[PDB]
RNA sequence: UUAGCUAGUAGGUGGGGUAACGGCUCACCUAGGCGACGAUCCCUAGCUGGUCUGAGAGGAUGACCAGCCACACUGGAACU
RNA sequence: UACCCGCAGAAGAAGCACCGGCUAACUCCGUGCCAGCAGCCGCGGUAAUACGGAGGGUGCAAGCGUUAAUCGGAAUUACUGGGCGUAAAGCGCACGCAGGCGGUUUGUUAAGUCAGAUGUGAAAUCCCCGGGCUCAACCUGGGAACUGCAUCUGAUACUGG
């Protein structure tokens, strides 16, 4: 069966339930870890299975377009919001950080708490939150701009 | 050893066999020594469908070449046809 | 895979009747036949050498209902074949089943004949052939199958056919709704204001 | 289409760079590279290194502007 | 069945061996000119009867050393 | 000229030097936006052309055009670039692929949409 | 130096012919005499003679038609700097057979046509039309 | 029955006190479809006067080529100023595969089956000049026989 | 914009060795062997049938199929 | 499963690029050296068929465009098949080793060259005429081709000894 989670799509390769390494069938009650999806989905969302994957490809790509359109939208606003070529005062000095957490649930959750410690004087911002581990383009990301 | 057998060419769902003499270890569609017949299982049978150079098959047997179950059948079938 | 839009536009652009309608009507009472489609139809094309070659190829394609890919492949085969390439191109077109069905008068148009073919109304040698581009051979017998024989389209189609010039290389029995592709048509059988060599020129450059 | 985020703010010619180029300092805040508008160049209109001038600035690049109003 | 080569002795220094050069003309694969090519062969000369400059007839045989797979058949012309 | 000469020194075809080396024989490459700015073009033209400097996944850093009217791109924007010079912009040898990755489509395009990453408008 | 006397022969013909000369003469040689033979036999010159014994001078009587030279083109093919040999089935023909190629075979010098018919190949000495 | 083909029309210009004077040039070929070809080139202030002057030139100044059943005798090379030209007698069925400038010449000439190609400058006036001369110097199985003084099989 | 390279090196005798010829190995002897027809050194690379292109000659190429080779985490080794 | 029969209704099935010249396809409105286009030339300051929208049209069509990539056109590395006075190109000049080439006659040789015979050049691929899947792609029989290499036997004009 083809499963679609958010803007991610794919066929399930295997199923894992808790300690149990393999389960053949899963009911509405007991939770089962899903595997074989294209990429790490959102921390949470509504998931719906489909009959065929081909029909679900355009839908998944459609959700990406909207999420990308709003991404560039929120990017243009924040930059234009100042309505001036620079900051009115001397808070321009900032610190950059690079974060990749193994779990998808944390990166969205703790970042909100990481924006709570932000102040007017020193501004901190997250760049390139990862789904897990570390990678070449991530270390390169910290190479261009000095960051932890 | 040396064996006489069917190397399966043709296309998907439309098998067509090339009868070949070869070292039994080589892959089925791989290196062979001599081609010696063919076998179309999908022939309309209005015309041909199975052709064997029985002279060279026997020559190779005479030198110890073995023969597939399926080629052993073809040979009995073709010997019956004429 | 088929041209589905307005048809008389095509005739109007090529400057000639392409027989894309039954022929029940003088074409000039259905469209402004001698004027191209569009805002600037009255405008004259001071037409380049490439232009005349293109339009001639389009003309033939639009007559037979063939899109570019298949038609190019038709040229390739005409070229490979022995004898004059230009003439070989027209033999190949004229041997198509949708075409032959039209020439025996089973269809009012090649479009209608093609539908007959696709919809399993045509047999070749008592065998059902339902692909339009099926190449028909000398001595073949194409027929309307029994169940399609009472279709009124076919009777009308045979009536109109009786009023067109009658093709030499086909023997048609209107009663049985069967007919025989006697031989490949010669060049001399086919219209003389087709300029194949232009099409041949277009595809060699 | 042509968006409309253009502006017409003024300023004063500062430098007399090469190929109808100037340092034009915007009365507003700073100065920009300012190049001479096609129109203006077609109608000649030399432009001394110290004139009040009108500039067309695309937010896209505030750093640059075209001289519209001759003097 | 006596396949054979003819060439001249460029070195006779070695004990019981000789170096023979076989020269031939060959059409150039691209530019058509006929070019000289040479093939030097280490050959066996038991008895060392072959002098440098000699023209000798040689044949191919089994390996006699790391580099000798040819032996002398007979001398043709000598001491030019 | 001489046969003899060619026999000593064969005809030797010149190796074509590429116009998009940063692509390294790939159809597109991905990269991060280093600077996003405007620049003026060469005689006889005049404008404020949108370009960006982009560090590619293979280390190369190049300037790339951002075609179309309007764009929402900034530093750290991850974009896709393709071959294609901008003639009145010397140095500019690549184009940005509108409507891929972080680069949005052109707003409100109706003609030539696919060259500007614009979906077909419901209608 | 004088390293190709056949090109020299071809050229003396070509130039005297171009210069509407009645005849041309050159130091002789068997190989020249063999070529002159083919030219005459195929009607590209009138006739020829060699005179002297110790320093033989060969003489070719040229041929003209409509106040035109019978010999339209005459070019060296194989040459000291690039020998050209052909097989029987590879023998060129000049002007689609209207002209000739002079070929040197194990059986002496003859035309492409002759050598072809006699199952031979050889060194392609020149073309003549 | 003579066949005539317009190969190229071009605008040149002459400068005087008052400014530029524009005129036109026309390059044409006439042929009898059976071995005779002429090319013409005319100049005039208006295009029709130029295309017409050229035909007039093309009709005289015409030459003969020794065709062979609608195809050439042997491969031929032609040359004139920038244009090196090359032609081959193809088998039957091929037709004329060639550039525009040459095709027009070969078509009106009656050369039914040929492989052609132009090298270097494709300047039409010199390309056609080079083709005509190629066909013109093209000799015939009979003349070489006459030349060589023998009517062997090669006749 | 690499001109010199080589001591098992080249050959000879004899012992050993391999399934088998062989500096394969060892001792002794001779002083050879390679190289501007490109050795040595440096860079790159699995080779072919064929594939794509070209009228051709060529140019480019070596997925899929088939033949040969080489490798099996890296370096080395032998046992059966 | 292929395939055959039956039922329902046009019913569930059309998009992409282009239209200044090269290059098939033209107008209006908007903009005004801006916003923008751009393979090459080159478009844009008030009539823009070149920008952007529209109507119209052209070319493709389950694809259409853009990018990347090889060869072609490119006779633009020219063996086939180019050049060096003034366009890129004669070393400032001479001597000269290696190398390339070498006047004319006879005999000899037979390496080059030429001829014939024999073996080999795997199959598949390419090509030709057929056969089989409704056609085509595809599959397949036979042929031709593999223009090459090698051995033997001859020919001796040309090149070499």
Curated annotation (Swiss-Prot), chain A:
One of the essential components for the initiation of protein synthesis. May protect N-formylmethionyl-tRNA(fMet) from spontaneous hydrolysis. Promotes N-formylmethionyl-tRNA(fMet) binding to the 30S pre-initiation complex (PIC). Also involved in the hydrolysis of GTP during the formation of the 70S ribosomal complex. Upon addition of the 50S ribosomal subunit, IF-1, IF-2 and IF-3 are released leaving the mature 70S translation initiation complex. Disruption phenotype: Essential, it cannot be deleted. The C-terminal region (residues 165-890) is sufficient for growth at 42 degrees Celsius, although it grows more slowly at 37 degrees and is cold-sensitive at 30 degrees Celsius. When overexpressed partially suppresses the slow growth and decreased 70S ribosome phenotype of an rsgA knockout; RsgA may be involved in 30S ribosomal subunit biogenesis. Silent mutations of codon 158, which no longer function as alternative start codons, decrease beta isoform expression to 31 to 50%, the strongest mutation is GUG to GUC. This is Translation initiation factor IF-2. It comes from Escherichia coli (strain K12). Induction: Part of the metY operon that extends to pnp. It is found in: Cytoplasm. It comes from the Bacteria. Belongs to the TRAFAC class translation factor GTPase superfamily. Classic translation factor GTPase family. IF-2 subfamily.
UniProtKB/Swiss-Prot annotation, chain C:
GO terms for biological process: cytoplasmic translation; DNA-templated transcription termination; maintenance of translational fidelity; negative regulation of translational initiation; response to antibiotic; ribosomal small subunit assembly; ribosomal small subunit biogenesis; transcription antitermination. Belongs to the universal ribosomal protein uS4 family. One of two assembly initiator proteins for the 30S subunit, it binds directly to 16S rRNA where it nucleates assembly of the body of the 30S subunit. This is Small ribosomal subunit protein uS4. Pfam families: Ribosomal_S4, S4. Keywords: Antibiotic resistance, Repressor, Ribonucleoprotein, Ribosomal protein, Ribosome biogenesis, RNA-binding, rRNA-binding, Transcription, Transcription antitermination, Transcription regulation, Transcription termination, Translation regulation. GO terms for molecular function: mRNA 5'-UTR binding; mRNA regulatory element binding translation repressor activity; rRNA binding; structural constituent of ribosome. GO terms for cellular component: cytoplasm; cytosol; cytosolic small ribosomal subunit; small ribosomal subunit. PROSITE patterns: RIBOSOMAL_S4, S4. The lineage of its organism: Bacteria, Pseudomonadati, Pseudomonadota, Gammaproteobacteria, Enterobacterales. Residues 95-155 form the S4 RNA-binding domain. It comes from Escherichia coli (strain K12). SMART domains: Ribosomal_S4 (SM01390), S4 (SM00363).
UniProtKB/Swiss-Prot annotation, chain D:
The gene is infA. One of its GO terms (molecular function) is ribosome binding. GO terms for cellular component: cytosol. NCBIfam families: infA (TIGR00008). Residues 1-71 form the S1-like domain. It is found in: Cytoplasm. The keyword rRNA-binding applies. Belongs to the IF-1 family. Disulfide bonds: none annotated. Keywords: Cytoplasm, Initiation factor, Protein biosynthesis, RNA-binding, rRNA-binding. This is Translation initiation factor IF-1. Its main location: cytoplasm. CDD domains: S1_IF1. One of the essential components for the initiation of protein synthesis. Binds in the vicinity of the A-site. Stabilizes the binding of IF-2 and IF-3 on the 30S subunit to which N-formylmethionyl-tRNA(fMet) subsequently binds. Helps modulate mRNA selection, yielding the 30S pre-initiation complex (PIC). Upon addition of the 50S ribosomal subunit IF-1, IF-2 and IF-3 are released leaving the mature 70S translation initiation complex.
From Swiss-Prot, chain H:
PROSITE patterns: RIBOSOMAL_S5 (PS00585), S5_DSRBD (PS50881). One of its GO terms (biological process) is ribosomal small subunit assembly. It holds the Pfam family Ribosomal_S5_C. Keywords: Acetylation, Antibiotic resistance, Ribonucleoprotein, Ribosomal protein, RNA-binding, rRNA-binding. One of its GO terms (molecular function) is structural constituent of ribosome. With uS4 and uS12 plays an important role in translational accuracy. Many suppressors of streptomycin-dependent mutants of protein uS12 are found in this protein, some but not all of which decrease translational accuracy (ram, ribosomal ambiguity mutations). The N-terminal domain interacts with the head of the 30S subunit; the C-terminal domain interacts with the body and contacts protein uS4. The interaction surface between uS4 and uS5 is involved in control of translational fidelity. This is Small ribosomal subunit protein uS5. It comes from Escherichia coli (strain K12). The gene is rpsE.
